[PDB]
Design a binder for this molecule. Structure first.
Ligand SMILES: CN1CCC(c2ccccc2CC(C)(C)Nc2nc(N3CCOCC3)nc(-n3c(C(F)F)nc4ccccc43)n2)CC1
Lengths: 934, 170
């Protein structure tokens, strides 16, 4: 099955048909075609083979000009084996990026055009314009600015004054100069040192830069050497750094490669419900449609219901539903929601489906006319509210087989109506002692008498409690345009709130466009380091947006175009959800806009997506063959599938998606294996100038990413207080439908595998991995890492911790794997207690039955960590509240948020929370002995 | 004066707890069945979209083949006439036979596209029946959840400890 029969269409109309090898590249195929075409008619009229370019229909159903004739036919992957010769004309660069974009984001660009939506076309035109602008400006910036953009500094949060040697090498020279430097030297200072060494065994230091050997990580800036990630890791590990001298000139080579006012329309709001379509329900029941207006999650009037109609595929109502609100009182973000349900005749209510629609379009126009809303199927939940107002306003893309409602907005004016501009809003919004006591009492759900007081002294809230803006936003009555006008008046003059408050304002409870713009305006203070910490939550709240062109998409694209690493992870956060029909349209547009501004990183991402495709096919081969053949003989069947030229070339010489600065060069086929358990994850080893990755297919790795991200956030928050608990914050990255990669920590093994070779194998393994003097250091790393992961797992509610899902590093560092559930969930919910393990307590006590001093130090480590986490509990709460948009099954209601409130004891003072934590620790100590005595 | 709608086997605590176990068992069973159906719903939706974009790719392939036919009918004209007034009718036969081969190839692709069209029609009815089965399962599923919660509240009011409740919910 090595050959494939290919059809060839020549520009003279001649047709040819012969088999070629599936693995030959397009250049070889063209030479073969030219050798056969000379014996076919009209050959004397074609030009040379190099005047033409192959054209095919790719997997995304688009025409593509196959410009890279070094691509194998199996890598091109045409729909049918049909190649057409066409002329080398046109922009060619634009046609190239247009085709590679459709294959990279997993959706054809033509699918956007076919929608015939002006909002889509306006988004693409504006967003792709701005992105191409930023890409063009970046190409003009200096070499130092480009080295910034492509590789931002990887720095520690942050220091003694040590001095150690370093191996500095030059480009293309095996000779390398080793010399000592101080840990507080700026990299320019060490730069000039290697220079005066080179000229005496006459360039200038500020013309060069420093690169880590075997990695796309660079050392520069006005920072001390100790603050760098690679250097700081080199000191604790004991290894001497290995750097490379790079001229600026080598960096440039990388860089080159009509006025009817709405408020005068006092008539009530109404719609015309007409017909349903493609309804599949029980024939004995009746169909009802529920409808209600919403601003965020708040009702704006009563839930006006329709009458019962017999169940059928195309039910007809033709009824008018009138709502208890006037047109002049509908907010800008007024969100009207339907829910079709089946009810037993009056003589177990079943929500069939639901659909939401904005009353104003993206151009601020009140929608009038016929609307066809393709619904989403209703999923049963805990709060069986028929109306689902938190759902997306986007339509179901499955248009040929999904149900829909035909509704009609009535004409209200001869000229169309808009929502008033900001100036017309501020004109409306422009117009004691005892009360200050209750204001402080309330701001330190609300209640009716308290709601009206906060709205009464709204100016006092702005002038004395600015961080309470979110509370004032909720008490505002949005169903009254006068109240709205006054609130937006105060909002347009609110002082700048810290990032913490802005994080809360990004929730779905605050849907006003003015609110989101105020929040984003406060998030602009974020550093790239801090913004990366919340990148995952920021992407998730995009599902909360009502329009395509929004402030948050603007901000995320801004930062992605300014920081290549941020753009890299923004790409994968969106690409890994393109199989979700709710966000495929919005994400695909953002992804296309991002690619047009990052033609360079497009090449890296293309290479990564191809390797991920090969791994999926590889894992599929292993899954199918692991059930019939024992694991020993399945490994070489893997190996045989990997050493294929297409497979080997695709899995080699790429940037890791888990870290774009990590280079995955040569595949160690021999060291590659798999796991003969569930999911059959792959273990892929590499060797550069030795990194591993884990390809897991079958499970959504988003919850595991959030878990590891939250652990990594605790590590940064602790290091900001001078508390280094020797964490192992390895990375986890979902790349597609139940597909992701897991970073591999070298020199690590499970608790179990070490305890199977009385149970002192833990201490003995540490002695054999840290001989003599190194033991003490290893025990200390174990003590700190045990405390931080004990506190982390208790705070996040991660139970089911046993010898299989805890690992040890050869340095003594402990860490966890395979977080199946969090927030107290198990095979059911319940608070996971604080857990101490005697097998571990044996190691902190250095083998002694009683080592009080060491144990009190370990308890101080635990308590200081828990104390620091309590200081940032609002950050964790806000991040989790935004994370509810992700749809994780164990993060969907306020009870999951309440788990973090109780685990961190945010309702109690620091004294009372520390005392209760003391009691929990003590009971965990008492439970650790009873754990293994049985 | 207060006559709330209590619908429980109001009797001994052990009997209500027994039926609490049976209702919770049925609820978890119905939930597993619905989750199986919802998985089939998601897979069928993915496959239907795959077949629909593959239909567009067939459309684009046939479009290119019809462009080739038109290009031939124009480009051939000048030559075909000259070869005739030159005795090269053997080569006219060559051009005409080659163009006939292009025609038959179009018919093959047309046939394969119609086959995928029929597969999509079948899967479209498959999708509609999976959604109908889900819609005939939900009423029970929600009723089973409400009954389980009602028995749980009755037991909680009577003073049953959390341990016995966990025993009945296992
Ligand atoms: C003799 N061989 C040696 C190779 C073993 C092997 C094969 C394939 C995949 C994995 C291994 C490793 C092993 C022990 C089974 N354990 C393991 N190791 C990690 N590592 C991530 C950190 O660095 C350390 C390695 N990660 C997971 N892991 C999985 C799992 F489903 F893949 N899901 C996860 C979800 C979240 C976090 C971690 C997760 N699990 C099989 C026997």
């Amino acid at each position: 099955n090595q050959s494939v029969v290919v059809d060839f269409l020549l520009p003279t109309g001649v047709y040819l048909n012969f088999p070629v090898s599936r693995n030959a590249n397009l250049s070889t195929i063209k030479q073969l075609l030219w050798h056969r075409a000379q014996y076919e008619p009209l050959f004397h009229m074609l030009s040379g083979p190099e005047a033409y370019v192959f054209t095919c229909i790719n997997q995304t159903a688009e025409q593509q000009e196959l410009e890279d004739e070094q691509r194998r036919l199996c890598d091109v992957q045409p729909f049918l084996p049909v190649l057409r010769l066409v002329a080398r004309e046109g922009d060619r660069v634009k046609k190239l990026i247009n085709s590679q974009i459709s294959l990279l984001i997993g959706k054809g660009l033509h699918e956007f055009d076919s929608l015939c939506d002006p909002e889509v076309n306006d988004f693409r035109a504006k967003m792709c314009q701005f992105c191409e602008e930023a890409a063009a400006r970046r190409q003009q910036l200096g070499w130092e600015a480009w080295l910034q953009y492509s590789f931002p500094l990887q720095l520690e949060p942050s220091l003694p004054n040590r001095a150690l040697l370093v191996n500095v090498k030059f480009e293309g020279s095996e000779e390398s100069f080793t010399f000592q430097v101080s840990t507080k030297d700026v990299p320019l200072a060490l730069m000039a040192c290697a220079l005066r060494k080179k000229a005496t065994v006459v360039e200038q230091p500020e013309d060069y830069t420093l690169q880590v050997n075997g990695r796309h990580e660079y050392l520069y800036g006005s920072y001390p050497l100790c603050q760098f990630q690679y250097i700081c890791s080199c000191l604790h590990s004991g290894l001497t750094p290995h750097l490379t001298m790079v001229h600026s000139s080598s960096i440039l080579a990388m860089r080159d490669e009509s006025s009817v006012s709405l408020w005068s329309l006092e008539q009530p709001f109404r719609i015309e419900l007409i017909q349903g379509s493609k309804v599949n329900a029980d024939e004995r029941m009746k169909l009802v449609v529920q409808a209600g207006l919403f601003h965020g999650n708040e009702m704006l009037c009563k839930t006006v219901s329709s009458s019962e109609v017999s169940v059928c595929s195309e039910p007809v109502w033709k009824q008018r539903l009138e709502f208890d609100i006037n047109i002049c009182d509908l907010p800008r973000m007024a969100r009207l929601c339907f829910a079709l349900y089946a009810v037993i005749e009056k003589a177990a209510d079943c929500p069939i489906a639901w659909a939401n629609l904005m009353l104003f379009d993206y151009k601020d126009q009140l929608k009038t006319g016929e609307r066809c809303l393709y619904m989403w199927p209703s999923v049963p939940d805990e709060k069986g509210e028929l109306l689902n107002p938190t759902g997306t306003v986007r339509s179901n893309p499955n248009t040929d087989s999904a149900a829909a409602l035909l509704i009609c907005l009535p004409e209200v004016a001869p000229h169309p109506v808009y929502y008033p501009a900001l100036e017309k809003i501020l004109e409306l919004g422009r117009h004691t002692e005892e009360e200050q006591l209750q204001l402080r009492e309330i701001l330190e759900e609300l209640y009716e008498h308290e709601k009206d007081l906060v709205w009464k002294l709204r100016h006092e809230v702005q002038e004395h409690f600015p961080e309470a803006l979110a509370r004032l936003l909720l008490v505002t009555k949005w169903n009254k345009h006068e109240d709205v006008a006054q609130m937006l008046y105060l909002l347009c003059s609110w002082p700048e709130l810290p990032v913490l408050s802005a994080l809360e304002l990004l929730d779905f409870s605050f849907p006003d466009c003015h609110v989101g713009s105020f929040a984003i305006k406060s998030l602009r203070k974020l550093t790239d380091d801090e913004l990366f910490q919340y990148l995952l939550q920021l992407v998730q709240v995009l599902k909360y947006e009502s329009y395509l062109d929004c402030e948050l998409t603007k901000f995320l694209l801004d930062r992605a175009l300014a920081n290549r690493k941020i753009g890299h992870f923004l790409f994968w956060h969106l690409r890994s959800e393109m199989h979700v029909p709710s966000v495929a349209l919005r994400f695909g547009l953002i992804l296309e806009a991002y690619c047009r501004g990052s033609t360079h990183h497009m090449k890296v991402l293309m290479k990564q997506g191809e390797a991920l495709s090969k791994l999926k096919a590889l894992n599929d081969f292993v899954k199918l063959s692991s059930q019939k053949t024992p694991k020993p003989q399945t490994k070489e069947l893997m190996h045989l599938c990997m050493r294929q030229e297409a497979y080997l070339e695709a899995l080699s010489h790429l940037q890791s998606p888990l870290d774009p600065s990590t280079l995955l060069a040569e595949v160690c086929v021999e060291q590659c294996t798999f796991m003969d358990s569930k999911m059959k994850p792959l273990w892929i080893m590499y060797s550069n100038e030795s990194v591993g990755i884990i390809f897991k297919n079958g499970d959504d790795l988003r919850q595991d990413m959030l878990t590891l991200q939250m652990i990594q956030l605790m590590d940064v928050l602790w290091k900001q207080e001078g508390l280094d608990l020797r964490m192992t914050p390895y990375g986890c990255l979902p790349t597609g439908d139940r597909t992701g990669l897991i970073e591999v920590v070298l020199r690590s093994d499970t608790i179990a595998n070490i305890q199977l070779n009385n149970k002192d194998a833990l201490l003995n393994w540490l002695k054999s991995k840290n001989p003599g003097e190194a033991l003490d250091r290893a025990i200390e790393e174990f003590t700190l890492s045990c405390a931080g992961y004990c506190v982390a797992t208790y705070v996040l509610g991660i139970g089911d911790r046993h010898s299989d899902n805890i690992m040890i590093r050869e340095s003594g560092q402990l860490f966890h794997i395979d977080f199946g559930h969090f927030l107290g969930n198990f095979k059911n919910r319940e608070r996971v207690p604080f857990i101490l393990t005697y097998d571990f307590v044996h190691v902190i006590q250095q083998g002694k039955t009683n080592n009080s001093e060491k144990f009190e130090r370990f308890r101080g480590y635990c308590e200081r960590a828990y104390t620091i986490l309590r200081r940032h509990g609002l950050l964790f709460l806000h991040l989790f509240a935004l994370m509810r948009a992700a749809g994780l099954p164990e993060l969907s209601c306020s009870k999951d948020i309440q788990y973090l409130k109780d685990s961190l004891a945010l309702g109690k003072t620091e004294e009372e929370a520390l005392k209760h934590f003391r009691v929990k620790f003590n009971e965990a100590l008492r439970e650790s002995w009873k754990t293994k005595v049985n | 004066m207060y006559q709330q709608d209590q619908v429980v086997k109001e009797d001994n605590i052990e009997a209500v707890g027994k039926k609490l176990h049976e209702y919770n068992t049925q609820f978890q069973e119905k939930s597993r069945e619905y989750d199986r159906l919802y998985e089939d719903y998601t897979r069928t939706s993915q496959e239907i979209q795959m077949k629909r974009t593959a239909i567009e790719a067939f459309n684009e392939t046939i479009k290119i083949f019809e462009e080739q036919c038109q290009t031939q009918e124009r480009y051939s004209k000048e030559y075909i006439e000259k070869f005739k007034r030159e005795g090269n009718e053997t080569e006219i036969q060559r051009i005409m036979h080659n163009y006939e081969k292009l025609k038959s190839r179009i018919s093959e692709i047309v046939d394969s596209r119609r086959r995928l069209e029929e597969d999509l029609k079948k899967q479209a009815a498959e999708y509609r029946e999976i959604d109908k089965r889900m819609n005939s399962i939900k009423p029970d599923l929600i009723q089973l959840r409400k009954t389980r919660d009602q028995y749980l509240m009755w037991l909680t009011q009577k003073g049953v400890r959390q341990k016995k409740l966990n025993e009945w919910l296992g």
